[PDB]
Amino acid sequence: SPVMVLENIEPEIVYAGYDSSKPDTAENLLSTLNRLAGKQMIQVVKWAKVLPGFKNLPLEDQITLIQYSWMSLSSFALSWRSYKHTNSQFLYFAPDLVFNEEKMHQSAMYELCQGMHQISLQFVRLQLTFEEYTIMKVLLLLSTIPKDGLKSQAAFEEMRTNYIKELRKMVTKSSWQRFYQLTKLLDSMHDLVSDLLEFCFYTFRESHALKVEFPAMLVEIISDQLPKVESGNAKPLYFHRK
């Protein structure tokens, strides 16, 4: 049962290391989020290595998928924590960092934070299950590829198709109507992720001007991803073309 493997390989939740004694400036909050994103990225690698089928993909493709999907996996997991721990009332970044209205404003990402809150509110509406969540998170890892395709495109397509089949088998437990609600939710991630990345690329490019710090893991990923996304080399994969 590959879904039972997914449930068991879910990473431990990470602390932000948020310093509530320091002023709650945009520089301090965003730097904490970036430190958090770096720690989460290590967890994504550990998880992806043991993800059924991932090892079949060549190293270049594994790197491409992780770099293209990092914001998608991260934002989808933030929505899950917000839903599980607060019934989507707040943004649960970490046990030590839960955003209220104050923090949404202070972060200088108010509108993006409300966009994220809208996704977590969809989890409540649909009553998303952990089983559905874990399959969908794998689909997000496989949702953005290069415009000219991957090195082993057929191997990737076989893995993606297999996980789509798993999601269809799973919706029978809570069925065509549910399947399309879940694929609609997955497609909706691309637009929010595009806006999150646009802000991340901005603070990255004007880093010391805005005092926003980035850990080494994020510097490396963004340095590679930013020219590729901006030159139109990233190809978001949609279940239903808008």
Binding site: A48, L59, Q62, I63, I66, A216, M217, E220
Partner: peptide, 10 residues
């Protein structure tokens, strides 16, 4: 090797 390459190959 990049940090991502290092982590994926270890």
């Amino acid at each position: 090797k990049s940090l991502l390459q290092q982590l994926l190959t270890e």
